[PDB]
UniProtKB/TrEMBL annotation, chains D, E, F:
One of its GO terms (cellular component) is viral envelope. The chain holds residues 21 to 334 of 560 of the full protein. Homotrimer of disulfide-linked HA1-HA2. It comes from Influenza A virus. GO terms for biological process: clathrin-dependent endocytosis of virus by host cell; fusion of virus membrane with host endosome membrane; fusion of virus membrane with host plasma membrane; viral budding from plasma membrane; virion attachment to host cell. Keywords: Calcium, Clathrin- and caveolin-independent endocytosis of virus by host, Clathrin-mediated endocytosis of virus by host, Disulfide bond, Fusion of virus membrane with host endosomal membrane, Fusion of virus membrane with host membrane, Glycoprotein, Hemagglutinin, Host cell membrane, Host membrane, Host-virus interaction, Lipoprotein, Membrane, Metal-binding, Palmitate, Signal, Transmembrane, Transmembrane helix, Viral attachment to host cell, Viral envelope protein, Viral penetration into host cytoplasm, Virion, Virus endocytosis by host, Virus entry into host cell. The gene is HA. This is Hemagglutinin. Its main location: host cell.
Amino acid sequence: GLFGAIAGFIENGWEGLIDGWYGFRHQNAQGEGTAADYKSTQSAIDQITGKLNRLIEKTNQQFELIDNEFNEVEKQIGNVINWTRDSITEVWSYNAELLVAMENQHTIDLADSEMDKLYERVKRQLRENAEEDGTGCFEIFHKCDDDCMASIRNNTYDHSKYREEAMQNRI
Amino acid sequence: GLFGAIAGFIENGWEGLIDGWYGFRHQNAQGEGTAADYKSTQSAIDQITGKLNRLIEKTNQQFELIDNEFNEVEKQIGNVINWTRDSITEVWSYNAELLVAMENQHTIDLADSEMDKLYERVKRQLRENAEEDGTGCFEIFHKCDDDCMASIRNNTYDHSKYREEAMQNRI
Amino acid sequence: GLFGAIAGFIENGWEGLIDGWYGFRHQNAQGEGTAADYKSTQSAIDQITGKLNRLIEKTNQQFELIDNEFNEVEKQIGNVINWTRDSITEVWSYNAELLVAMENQHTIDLADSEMDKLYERVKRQLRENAEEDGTGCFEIFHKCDDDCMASIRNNTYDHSKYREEAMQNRI
Amino acid sequence: ICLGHHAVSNGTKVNTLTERGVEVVNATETVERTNIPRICSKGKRTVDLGQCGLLGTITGPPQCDQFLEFSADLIIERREGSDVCYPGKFVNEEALRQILRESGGIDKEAMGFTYSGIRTNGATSACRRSGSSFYAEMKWLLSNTDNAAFPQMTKSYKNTRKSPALIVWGIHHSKSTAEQTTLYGSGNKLVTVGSSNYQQSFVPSPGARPQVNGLSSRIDFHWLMLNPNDTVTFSFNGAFIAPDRASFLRGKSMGIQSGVQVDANCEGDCYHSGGTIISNLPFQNIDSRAVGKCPRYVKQRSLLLATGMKNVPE
Amino acid sequence: ICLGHHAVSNGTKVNTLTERGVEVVNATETVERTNIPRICSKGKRTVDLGQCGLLGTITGPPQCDQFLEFSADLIIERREGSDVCYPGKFVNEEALRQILRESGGIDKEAMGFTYSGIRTNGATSACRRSGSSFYAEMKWLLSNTDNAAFPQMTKSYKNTRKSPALIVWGIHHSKSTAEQTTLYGSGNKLVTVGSSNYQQSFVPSPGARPQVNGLSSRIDFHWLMLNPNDTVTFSFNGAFIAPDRASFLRGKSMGIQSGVQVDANCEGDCYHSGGTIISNLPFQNIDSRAVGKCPRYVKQRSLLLATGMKNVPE
Amino acid sequence: ICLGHHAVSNGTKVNTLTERGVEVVNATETVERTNIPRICSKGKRTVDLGQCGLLGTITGPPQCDQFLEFSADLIIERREGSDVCYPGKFVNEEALRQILRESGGIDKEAMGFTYSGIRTNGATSACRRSGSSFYAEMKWLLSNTDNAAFPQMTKSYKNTRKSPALIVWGIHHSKSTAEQTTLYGSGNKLVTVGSSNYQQSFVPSPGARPQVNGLSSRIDFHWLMLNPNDTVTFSFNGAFIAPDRASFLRGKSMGIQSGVQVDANCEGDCYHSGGTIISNLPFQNIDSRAVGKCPRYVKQRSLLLATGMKNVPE
Ligand SMILES: CO[C@]1(C(=O)O)C[C@H](O)[C@@H](NC(C)=O)[C@H]([C@H](O)[C@H](O)CO)O1
Ligand SMILES: CO[C@]1(C(=O)O)C[C@H](O)[C@@H](NC(C)=O)[C@H]([C@H](O)[C@H](O)CO)O1
Ligand SMILES: CO[C@]1(C(=O)O)C[C@H](O)[C@@H](NC(C)=O)[C@H]([C@H](O)[C@H](O)CO)O1
Ligand SMILES: *[C@@H]1O[C@H](CO)[C@@H](O)[C@H](O)[C@H]1NC(C)=O
Ligand SMILES: *[C@@H]1O[C@H](CO)[C@@H](O)[C@H](O)[C@H]1NC(C)=O
Ligand SMILES: *[C@@H]1O[C@H](CO)[C@@H](O)[C@H](O)[C@H]1NC(C)=O
Ligand SMILES: *[C@@H]1O[C@H](CO)[C@@H](O)[C@H](O)[C@H]1NC(C)=O
Ligand SMILES: *[C@@H]1O[C@H](CO)[C@@H](O)[C@H](O)[C@H]1NC(C)=O
Ligand SMILES: *[C@@H]1O[C@H](CO)[C@@H](O)[C@H](O)[C@H]1NC(C)=O
Ligand SMILES: *[C@@H]1O[C@H](CO)[C@@H](O)[C@H](O)[C@H]1NC(C)=O
Ligand SMILES: *[C@@H]1O[C@H](CO)[C@@H](O)[C@H](O)[C@H]1NC(C)=O
Ligand SMILES: *[C@@H]1O[C@H](CO)[C@@H](O)[C@H](O)[C@H]1NC(C)=O
C-alpha cells in the first residue's frame, strides 16, 4: 500500500485478531493481551460499504429486443446491430475491469491509511513517554499496568501524569 | 480523508479564517492571532483549477441529425437508432457519475494531504523546541513573541537560537 | 505529489544518482559517498511494470468490415454506421485520455510515497540518535564512519550501541 | 504496546492497478453468472403466445384465436409460433413484431367494409375450424363464380379514433395464372393503397412455389399505421385479402423470446432466452442479448472487488 | 502555535467513491441544464426554410421558390414545411434529407432535355402562381392531345461537372386508369433509369387515393447521384415528371429542426428543437438528440464536482 | 546522512489529473501511430482477389475463373475488382459481400437443372474466353430461335446438404422491347422464386441504359440462402439467367479492402486499407475503420504514460 504500514513496517497481521480489523497487543508485568479498536475499524467498514452500495445500484433503463433469435433479421442490418452490440460490449468490459482494478487499489490503500492514523494518533498520545521500535510497537519507558494500557486504548492516557518517570528512564 | 488531518486529529475548521485555506493560530503573552499561509493554499487552488480546466474543455466533434422529429423515420431503423443512442447514453451517464465521484474523492484527499505537509514542515521547523499536542498544535517550550510566531510562518525560525531554553524547559 | 517528499521538502533530485531511483548520500570524516537502495527502487519499478503490463494486453475481439471504401454503401445506413462509429470513437478517446491522466497521477504519487517510506524507516532506525533537518537529511549526533553509514543502509544499525554518545551530544 | 491488523489463513486473490493476484481478506463478485431457468413473471400480466405467432394475432390464423384482443405487460414468443396458416409472409415483418412487443396488447374494431357483386367467404383447408376457414380478421374476396370478372373497386376506412390504426391487407399469389383467373378473372390485377402519408401499389404474381401446408400459392400480408382522422383507401381488382378489423395498441409492454417455462413465483426484470437474471450486481456474463432492466453484459466471467484489507499472514 | 483549515456555515453536499452527501466548502455543476430558447446563429449564414420543405428546394413547389439555389452554413427545417404541392412523396426521403443538410446549399444547372411531339406544360391548381403552374424545376410531360399516344422516348444527361449531380424525376399515378390514358394514352407505361452505378425500372399505378389538396392522384419523386463524366439516361413512355435542372452541392453545412426563433445575437454550436445549448460544461441533461458540437447527454440532472476541501464546521 | 531521488537533465512531459505538462523521468506512448504499409499475411491462407470482384466468385465472369472455389482465411478485395462482365449489379450486394468475407471460401455443386425446348448457350462479347462466352456458373436461357415463344417453365432444386445453399439467378433487361422479344418472344415475362422462408416476383424491364462494355442492356443478379432439406423453385417465362451451381460456405474467414502488397514475412491481426497495424499498444490513431483484432481507435495522436517519478532537476 501507499502508506507502508500494512504489508509494510508492520511485518504481518494477526490471525488471532477475530474481533476487529485493527487493534493493540500490549505487554506488561501481568502478561500480554489483545483487543480491537472499534473506531478505526468502523471507519474502514463504512467506507468499503459505501463503495459496495454504489456498485449494487439498480439501473432503471430498459432495452428492448432489436434482432431475432427464431427468425434471423436481414443480414446487413443484422451485421450493423451485431457490430454495435459488440462495440458496446468492448466498452463495458473495459469499464468493469478498470473500475474493479481502481476500486481494489483504493480499497487496499484505504485500509493501509487508517492503520497509519491509529498508529500516529497513539504515538502522539504517548508524547515523550515512549519511542517507536520501527515495527508498530511503542516501547513504554514507565510501568504500564492493565488499567494503563486500557487508558491508551480508550484515549484517557494522560502523558503528564507519568511524564517524570518515563523521562526518568530515557536518560 | 486518507491523511487523517482534515476531519481527523484536527477536530474542525475555522469559520473566521476568511483569508486562506490553511493557516496558523498562535498564542503567546501578547494574545492570539490568526493568519493564512499562502504557499500551501495556492498549491491546492492550483491543483483544483487544473481539474476544473480539464472538465471545461470544448470538444470539437460534430454529430448530425440521423432520425426525424417531424416525420418519423422507418420504424426498424428507428429502433436501431434509438437503441444505439440509449446505449451510448448509458455509457456517458456512467462515465459522468464515476468521473465526478472519483474526482471528488481525490479533491477531498488532496486538500487533506496539503494540510499534513504544512503541519509536518512546521514540526520539523521547530525541531526539538516543541512537542505536538495531538490536535494540530505545537506547545512551544520557550517564550515566543509576535516576531517569533511570524518567523515560523515565513520560514525564518532558527531552532538553534532558542535551543538552550526550549530544552531547558522540557526537563 | 500527495506525500510532499519528491518535489517537496527534499528540494531536488540527484542527476549523479545513476544506480537507483532512491538512495542515501552521507557525510562523515572520510568524506561523502552515494549509493542506491535496491529494495525501495525495486518496489516502484515492480508497481509501474504491472501498470505497463495491464496496458499492453492484447484484446481478442474481432470486428469485421460493415461499410465499403470502394463502393459506398447506401447513404442512410451509412450515416447510421458513421454516427455510431464516431460515437464509439468519442467514448474511447475519453477513456484513453482519462486513463492516462489518472494513471500518471497515481504513478507520480506512487513514487513520492515510496520515498517517504524510505525516509521514515530510516528515521525510526536512528531512533533517538539523530534529528531531521527538514530537507531529507538526518544530522547524526555521534561519529559515524563508512561502516556505520553502510550499517544504516543495509538495516544493521543498532541504535542502542551508540545511544550513550548520540544522547551525550544532544544535551 | 504494539499496533496491528487482522489476517486469515485462506484469503481471496483480486487484481489492482499495479498487481494481479494480490491476496485480500474478503472480496465479492461483481459479475453475475447465476441464471434462473424460467421466465419470472410474478406481478406481471403475461401472455405466452405459444403456437400463436406474434404477427398472427393481427390476422388471426386458427392457432391465434385466443389472442385476437390480448392484453399484456410481458409478451413471450415461442419457437413453435406461426404467424400464418395459409403460407405467406409479412413485409417488414420485424418492424411490425417490434411494434407489437411494446404495444401492451391490441384492441380490435370493425373497419366497416361492405361488398356487393363478389363472394367474401374464401376458405382453405390450411385454416381449419371444424371445416375449411380463413384468417378470422380478414376476408378472401373472390369473383362470384369461377372465371367471372372481379370489378375494380375502391373501399375506404376513416380512423375515427385517437391513436394510430394498424391496417393489414394481403396479396394472394395463386399457384398458376390459370388458377388466378378461376378465382378473379383474367388480366393484370392491381391493388393501390394510399393515405395522407403513404402510397404503394401491388400486382399479384402467380407461379409455382414449394408446397407449404399442401399449397404452392402464397399470401403477402402488408401493413400501415393510419393516423387519427386520416383515411386509408384500397383500390383493387382481385387477389386482395381485405381487412375486416383494424388493430389499436393498448398501451405499453415488453416482448421476449424464450424456451423456458413461466414462473409466477419469482419476480424479475431482465430476461433472455434461457430464463431470468435476478441480480443486484452491475455486470453479467450470461447473455449479451438480454432485454429488460439488466446488468451490463461483459466478457469477463469474474471480476472480484476487494471488500477488505490486504491479507498478510505469517 | 496551532495549525488549522477553513470552513463555512453553509456548504454544498457532493458524492464520492466512498460516501454520498459529503459536505465540501464549494462545488460546481458539471451537467448543463440551462437552455436558451432560440437558434443562436450569430456569424453563420442561416437559411430558415419556413414553409418550404427541405426536399422541396430540389423540385420547387411554390413555397420553395425563394430557396431553389440557397446557400447556407446552418439549415433550419420548420414543422409547417412541405416538400410537395401536387401530393406525393420522395422514395428514400430521409437519406436525401440527410444529404441536403450537410450540403452547404445547392447550385442548379439546366440538364438540357429538349422534346418534340408532346406537351411539356403540365400544370395543376395545387401549384398556383397567379394561375395553374407546376414544380419549377420539373416538367410534366403529356401527350399532345387527350388520349393521344405518348411515344416511347429516351433522354440522356451527361454530368460534365466535377462533383456528383443530383437528378430527380417523378412518376405520376393518375386518379384512375381512364384518367391516365387521357393524359398519356392507354397500355402499360414504363420508365427505365440507368447510369454507370444505377439501374431501376418504374411503371405508374393509377388508382383512387384520399384527396390531399383536392387530388386523388399522386407523384412519386425519385432521385440518384450522377458521378462526374457519368451519364444518366431516361427511357419512358408516359407518366413521367421529367427533370429540367440538376442540382449540385455547394460545400458543407449542418441541418437542425427547430420550433424557435433565430437570434443573430447569441453564438452557439449545439442545437436541439428547443433552442441552443451554450455551455463549457462537459455534460447536458436537456435533449439527448441535440446536434452540432455538444456536451455529452447524461440522464443525471446534476453531478456536483467538489472544488474545495471537506467542510468540518463546529 | 541524507535521503534523495534521481533526476535527469532532459525528461519527458506528461499530463495528469491536476496538471498538464508535468515533467517525469521517462514515459512511454500508449497511442500507436506507426503503420507498416503491407498486408501482413504470414501463417494465413490468403486470397488476393485482384481484378476479380468478390461477388463475381459466385457468378464467374472471366476475371474470376481462378476463384470459383477459393479457400481462404483472409480475403483481399482490390479497387480494380469487378463483379460483372455483362453489365449489371447485385441486389443487396453489400449483405452478400459481408456474407462472403466471413465464409472461409466457397464450394460449388451442380444444382441439376436440365432443359428442353430452349437454347441454353447464351454468350456475349463482354465475357470473352477465346470467343463469346458467359458467366461460368450461370446459363443464359433463350428461345430456340429468334422471336419464338419461351415456354413458362418451373425448375426446382433441393438442398440435400447440411449447410445453407447460396443460390443466385439473374434478370435480363434487354436494350429495347424489340430486342427482348427476339430473345424470348413478346408479352409480359415473369420469374417467381419461392422457398420455405422466401417469396419474391420479378418482371424484366427493357429500355435504353448508357453503354457499359458496349451494351445498353443489363443483368440483375439476385440471391437467397436455401436451408438444408428446403427446396427453391423457379417459375419463369424468359429473361432469366439461371443458376447452374449452388455455392456453399467453407468455414470462417475475414475480409479486408487494401491497396497495398501482400507480405508473407510479417504477421498481423489488424488491417486497414493502408497496411497492417502491429502493436501491443491499447490505442491507435491510424484508421478508425481498421478491422481484425485491433487497438481501439482514438482521436489523440499521442497519450504519454508516465513510467517514472517526477523529475525535479536543479
Ligand atoms: C386445391 O384446393 C383448395 C383448398 O385449399 O381447400 C380448395 C378450396 O376451396 C380453394 N379455395 C377457394 C376460395 O376457392 C383452394 C384454392 O384453389 C387455392 O388455395 C388457391 O391457390 O384450394
Ligand atoms: C380535375 O383537375 C385539374 C387540376 O388539377 O387543375 C385540371 C388540370 O388542367 C389537369 N392537368 C392537366 C396537366 O391536364 C389536372 C389533372 O387531370 C389531374 O391533376 C391528374 O390526376 O386536373
Ligand atoms: C449486339 O450484340 C451481341 C453481343 O453482345 O455479342 C451479339 C450476341 O450474339 C447477342 N447474344 C445472344 C445470346 O443472342 C447479344 C445480345 O443481342 C445483347 O447482348 C442483348 O441485349 O448481342
Ligand atoms: C448476430 O449474433 C448472433 C449471436 O452472436 C448470431 O448467431 C447471428 O448470426 C448474428 N446475426 C447475423 C445477421 O449474422
Ligand atoms: C425514438 O425516440 C423518440 C424520442 O425518444 C421517440 O418519440 C420515437 O418514437 C422513437 N423512434 C421510433 C421509431 O420509435
Ligand atoms: C462515412 O465515413 C467515410 C470516412 O469518414 C466517408 O468518406 C463516407 O462518405 C461516410 N459515409 C457516408 C454514407 O457518407
Ligand atoms: C466477505 O464478502 C461479502 C461481500 O461483502 C460479504 O457478504 C461476506 O459476508 C464477507 N465475509 C466475511 C467473513 O467478512
Ligand atoms: C378529428 O376531427 C374531429 C371532428 O370530426 C375533431 O373534433 C377532433 O378534435 C379531431 N382530432 C384530431 C386528432 O385531429
Ligand atoms: C465556488 O465554485 C465555483 C466553481 O469553482 C466558483 O466559480 C465560485 O466562485 C466559488 N466560490 C467561492 C465562494 O469560493
Ligand atoms: C472527364 O473527361 C474530360 C475529357 O472530356 C477529362 O479532361 C477530365 O479529366 C475527366 N474528369 C473526370 C473526373 O473523369
Ligand atoms: C523509459 O520508457 C520505456 C517504457 O517503459 C522503456 O522501454 C525505456 O527503456 C525506459 N528508458 C529508461 C532510460 O529508463
Ligand atoms: C434431412 O432429411 C433426411 C432424410 O431425407 C434426414 O435423414 C436428415 O436428418 C434431415 N436433416 C435436416 C437438417 O433436416
